[PDB]
Subunit: 388 residues, 4 copies
Amino acid sequence: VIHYSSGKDLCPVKGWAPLSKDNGIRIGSRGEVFVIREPFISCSINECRTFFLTQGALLNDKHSNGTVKDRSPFRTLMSCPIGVAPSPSNSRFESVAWSATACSDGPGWLTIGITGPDATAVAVLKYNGIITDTLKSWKGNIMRTQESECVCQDEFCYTLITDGPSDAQAFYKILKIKKGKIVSVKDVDAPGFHFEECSCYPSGENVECVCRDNWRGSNRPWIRFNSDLDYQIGYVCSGVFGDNPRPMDSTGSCNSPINNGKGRYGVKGFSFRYGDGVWIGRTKSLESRSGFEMVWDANGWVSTDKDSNGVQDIIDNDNWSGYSGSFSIRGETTGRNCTVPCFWVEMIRGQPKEKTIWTSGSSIAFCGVNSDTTGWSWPDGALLPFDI
Amino acid sequence: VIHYSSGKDLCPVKGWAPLSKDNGIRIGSRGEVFVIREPFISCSINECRTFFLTQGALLNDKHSNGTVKDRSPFRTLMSCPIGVAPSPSNSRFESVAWSATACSDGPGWLTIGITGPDATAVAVLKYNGIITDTLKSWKGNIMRTQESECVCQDEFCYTLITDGPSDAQAFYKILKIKKGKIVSVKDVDAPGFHFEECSCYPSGENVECVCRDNWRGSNRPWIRFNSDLDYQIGYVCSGVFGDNPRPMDSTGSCNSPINNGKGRYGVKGFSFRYGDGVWIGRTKSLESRSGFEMVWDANGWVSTDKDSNGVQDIIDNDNWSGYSGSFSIRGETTGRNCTVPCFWVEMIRGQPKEKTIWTSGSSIAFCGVNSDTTGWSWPDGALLPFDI
Amino acid sequence: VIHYSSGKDLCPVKGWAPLSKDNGIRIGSRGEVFVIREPFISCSINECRTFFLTQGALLNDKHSNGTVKDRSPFRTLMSCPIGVAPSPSNSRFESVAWSATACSDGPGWLTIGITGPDATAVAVLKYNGIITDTLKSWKGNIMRTQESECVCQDEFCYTLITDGPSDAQAFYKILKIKKGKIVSVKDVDAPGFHFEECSCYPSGENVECVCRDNWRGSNRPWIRFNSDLDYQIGYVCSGVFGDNPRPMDSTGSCNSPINNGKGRYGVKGFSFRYGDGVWIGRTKSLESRSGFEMVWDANGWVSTDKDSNGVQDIIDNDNWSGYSGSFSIRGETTGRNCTVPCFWVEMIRGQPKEKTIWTSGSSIAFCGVNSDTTGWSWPDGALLPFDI
Amino acid sequence: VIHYSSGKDLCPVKGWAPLSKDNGIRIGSRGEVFVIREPFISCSINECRTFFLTQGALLNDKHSNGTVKDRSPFRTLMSCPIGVAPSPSNSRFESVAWSATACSDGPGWLTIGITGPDATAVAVLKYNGIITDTLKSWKGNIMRTQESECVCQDEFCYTLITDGPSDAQAFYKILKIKKGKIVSVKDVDAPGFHFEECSCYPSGENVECVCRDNWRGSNRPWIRFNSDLDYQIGYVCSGVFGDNPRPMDSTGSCNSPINNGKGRYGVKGFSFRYGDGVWIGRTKSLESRSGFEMVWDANGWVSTDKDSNGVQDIIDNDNWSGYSGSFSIRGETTGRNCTVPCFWVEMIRGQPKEKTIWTSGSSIAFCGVNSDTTGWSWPDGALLPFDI
Ligand SMILES: CC(=O)N[C@@H]1[C@@H](O)[C@H](O)[C@@H](CO)O[C@@H]1O
Ligand SMILES: CC(=O)N[C@@H]1[C@@H](O)[C@H](O)[C@@H](CO)O[C@@H]1O
Ligand SMILES: CC(=O)N[C@@H]1[C@@H](O)[C@H](O)[C@@H](CO)O[C@@H]1O
Ligand SMILES: CC(=O)N[C@@H]1[C@@H](O)[C@H](O)[C@@H](CO)O[C@@H]1O
Ligand SMILES: [Ca+2]
Ligand SMILES: [Ca+2]
Ligand SMILES: [Ca+2]
Ligand SMILES: [Ca+2]
């Protein structure tokens, strides 16, 4: 009935409590389930939904051959209630796209789907399913975005967009959106920096995003910005590197990418700042997308220690993980005076690791909680290969 | 909460932005999906839905043999949210029909299904699923209609209906409907003209429709009419012929059908007038239903040039297309002071082209947008033949 | 928002217009569809739904073996929007029952499911899914009911129930229900009469039902009653016999069963009185459940002519039909000052006629309409046998 | 619109009327249905839903191998309308859990899912899908709960939780929850007693629960408590033992477990107190989970007779039963001044009894009713083995 207002800080967090798990791939063994990627959650005052990307093909069907390009004309953004299998029967259509972001300003939904050829990609903005605006590739090199929820406060929604090489220097922009309309956008001058698939959240009148450096950083770059779009950037200080691949924990860097031969590629991830502290979610393996854990490093944000203060296990290393992202449940939902931070974890199955003709994901999600919790292993559970 | 009012012009349009794609046929490879035809969109103040026709048979099932007549007692009009597969699980029933039209007057839905034997076809009118009226064949020769959404303004909804030979002179009627009730109807005297499957839209107190000539016109006939039903007809002036089949672009004709050996048959299509200008959506091939593009011809409506001013690619020629139609998103939806023009494209797969025992469609849709866009190819994506 | 009020007569009717067809069996060839029987429609001010009975088994599955008794502990009453396949995905649960009836008093739903052993059957009454009352077998011989919608006026809902031999004299009761509560019930003294599966409707302060005589009547028995339950009975005068089996049209009887060697068994059916006139829906065949037609006999109700005044074809004789019933759309729905009469037709496929291990139904429905219509053939369309 | 208030007694009950049956396993033979356990019902003022536990695997699919632990990271709590098959298409996600409870305080839903490793299990509390609180294992030995609905009155919801050996003495706690928040909790000192899977209900300002003793009681232990959490415990006096396994009916014990060599293990069950009387629902067999019946023992609660006063058959002994539980429909729903007691019955199929690689359940439910009823047999109906 009202919009998400700003000026709120994240809630106190001791440990993470399980919110949802869908077993999408296990169910897909026989049921009708879309081949997914990017199962990211986003909530409005009344609902939480999982958004994802599909090639428009179902599990255990030839059309899941995955010979196809990640960026194809068939890829669309869809959504469904959290916890349920992303089947064609309980999934809503969002937009044609091979890269996107979505979020609620409170009473409605903002979706941004980027589709088209690589040289001239276009983002189609929509407020409640209605095209409200569009942004075209300003650099001509695979324009892309969050693949995680954008953030809204005081009727305004913000996001980050990248265009350029995943090889080196790329170009970035922050957007300010009102009911699907683009009200100003800022160019981000971050020489040396590489921003991709940002996991954002709100923190008192500002918007903080912890992203992915695919150029040469094993540590993650972050950016915080104004409703005017005044910004600040840097990498997460902490030696508890949070990307993948990554070297062993060494002395970190708060303003530059730490390569160490493993800083090259990466994976979408998130982190939650808490003053000088930081919560780092990351894989267990240093080179593969397996296992996942949440690390609380009291200095994370200000220091460069490789020393933390607690680790909660989410998925053990004998199991597969994948994309990770942040989303928040607001005070307008929970009668609270703070924002509840949560995160979803993609659990990739199939190619290139396992021997299948396909590649899909399943998910689990967790939320803040300033009470007791437990670590454990909540893997995908599918038994591959399938009837391949 | 209120009805769609008149006196509004189409919004400014630079290029077309993707709105939805369903991948219905790709999903049908394993999922439960109806064999479709005519996937046309129609919106109410709060929702957009895709209406389509089914023989009541699912893809990859013997009942899809398609040996059956297009006009069978099994054919029904159904609808579903846009973007989702037209499965029996997410499709609503509209009416028994082998030819139809539907549209919203704002707060409700008007559906018209034509069923029965060829000699005595009957249109059953319904407002919100309740039979409100009926019209019977007045010529006794396959009475039929739009196969695209009708148009409503100031509580009144209008449509066009044809009865007679697809071979030559046919007979036409314009209807005026109020809450499913027929308030007057007009006979259209168009000697030399052949109107079929009209793609209509509203334009300030009037209703413009660009239809299909199956007799001998490679160019398309149009008609514009009053709320009193005073009308005007003619063909689209432009040399950029918009039907299929069609000869190469030559000098057009604003008041008569241009045959050139290819003016015979045809395909459902649409066009959007803009003063002396016109937006022409058409196939790429001159003789097959493949490829699709949107052409902006500044004189389209007044001149006969074969010269246009821009072409946006939708589906390339190596891929299949099919029926095309118009639908509009009103100001009561978008806070705008104009109407947003949009269009859907049917992508036929199977017979007679491909080697299958069936024939179905998939869809993609686009909307106006006075911002940046991109052309590309958004084909059906299904890999035929199926388990045939 | 308000209840269905009484004091309304049926609307004028020239012919019958198609309302819905589901193709349930054709879709069941591959999709998930319950094996049905009794697909009867019932509407509330805002919605029309099809109620049916299932053994809890799907088409093309071993559990559809139909070796099972019609009256089994697995049989339940369910419902779904009209026109859609009675799949487990779009069907709502109503009640455990092997015989039932349902109807809306306007704002809510009344369902009556009869289940249990033959000697001690019990009807469980529910208003909006909540058990409101119960009635037990008062004769101890397969207590049963309408298998068609009951009728409600001024908050009160009425139905008919039978207990006793289908072989000869049976015992009957009329009920008066208020919000699921039984407010009085009357015993019907009809010696010589045999009432089963009544197809009722409202007609100005009264409730008229045309039922089925399984004892020895080829013509149909009827009953009309007060809100006090004062009643009158008799058979439909007309020589245009409306049951199945039945002899050729001869001179009818207004107060007794006409046997003629074919008056034995029967099939559920309906008729609509209109003064001295009557609309008779019946099969085409005199001995099998095939073909269906609507006959208008101006004297039907008062005379015994075998002469009618018009016949509209619904399903031709080369095709299968089955149960038939009545339902009405009220003035509170249609802005009309009269009741719109409608009827649904069950189209049985499989055993005992066709060679399958199962037996199911599909449906089509029609409504009043005082405008133009057309007869035709709208059969089930399934191609048996199935993967049997 | 309002909350469930206290101070109400159970309604008068003569016999039990069938409310719902789902045939989930029969439908699962071909349709998409989750492998279930604990299909317990819980209602809010406007709706009744069946909650259940799934391993996230469908019937007739390899992932149903059931080689997996009951407590796995894949197990989740889900819900759906009563009577419908627990398919992925009509089931809502509730929470990640291998043990849970749920209930409505009137306008909303409270769900409690317990997940994680055995040594450190955690209950995640949620009000309307939003994590509101958490409780961790205080004894470190498989913390678990009701597996039946909790009870709410005057905005407060109560439940029982166990932690410790199923072998002997265990430790118990009663909780008081307000909108998902834990407002105080009490330790239950019950030396000699063993409480597990309690079937609770409200009875005038108090909450009565009849549970399961897995240590050495063939009779069932009960507990009643205050909104302050002042409590009283004991076993059900009656000689009509209500657990399984159990010895033949002997003289019972109101304050201690009656072993008799069969008091060891057990099964979830319920009972309804009525003054000195009690309604006992139990299996027919004394050692297997087969058959089910409801027994009315006028002294049940106060005496130790093996003499009852009436028995209603639900499922005969030639058929399988399983978990049993209680749920109530409040006065805020039924215009009544009392609470309507109801109960659901799980009907386990497969392992370890039958020869399949899986184990699932189906359900039937009944409600109070102070009118006529009938006993009978309403088994699961599935024909095993499946395509195994
Ligand atoms: C199960 C199947 O069809 N696998 C095929 C494979 O045989 C072929 O080499 C490849 C490339 O087109 O596409 C799929 O992976
Ligand atoms: C896969 C299949 O059954 N194809 C049949 C074909 O063999 C037969 O000639 C034809 C005409 O009845 O109907 C289908 O096309
Ligand atoms: C396809 C199939 O299983 N048919 C069987 C049949 O073989 C058996 O004689 C009968 C009686 O139990 O049950 C079904 O009709
Ligand atoms: C149908 C099937 O696959 N059954 C297998 C069985 O062969 C194997 O021994 C067991 C243990 O892993 O798992 C299932 O029960
Ligand atoms: Ca990196
Ligand atoms: Ca032509
Ligand atoms: Ca008879
Ligand atoms: Ca025991």
